[PDB]
Amino acid sequence: DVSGTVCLSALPPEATDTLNLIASDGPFPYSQDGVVFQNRESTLPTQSYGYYHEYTVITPGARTRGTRRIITGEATQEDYYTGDHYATFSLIDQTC
């Protein structure tokens, strides 16, 4: 299940950075960035393998990738933000 929508401006500034890197198709800071997201738990809508990809949303001070990510969907303007390590997701609205 998706936890509604959220304006880009209401997410950490790093979320905006990640989306800009995605728009330029990288380069990305972490190797895991750009790999396929399997949606193994079916938290997001059911789609074929490869429809989703995951990208890191840097957490200030973290030595690791942290718990924040943006999952892209192949559809136009389809992006999901998770701040709790894939537990919940919110559709990102880049228009606000």
From Swiss-Prot:
Q: Does the keyword Electron transport apply?
A: no
Q: Per its UniProt record, what InterPro entries does this chain match?
A: N1-like, Ribonuclease/ribotoxin
Pfam families given for it?
Ribonuclease
GO cellular component, alphabetical, reads:
extracellular region
The catalytic site is made up of: E54, H85
Q: Does the keyword Repeat apply?
A: no
Question: What reaction gets catalysed by this protein?
Answer: [RNA] containing guanosine + H2O = an [RNA fragment]-3'-guanosine-3'-phosphate + a 5'-hydroxy-ribonucleotide-3'-[RNA fragment]
Where do transmembrane segments lie in this chain? none
Matching CDD domains: RNase_Sa
Specify the protein name: Guanyl-specific ribonuclease Sa
Native species of this protein? Kitasatospora aureofaciens
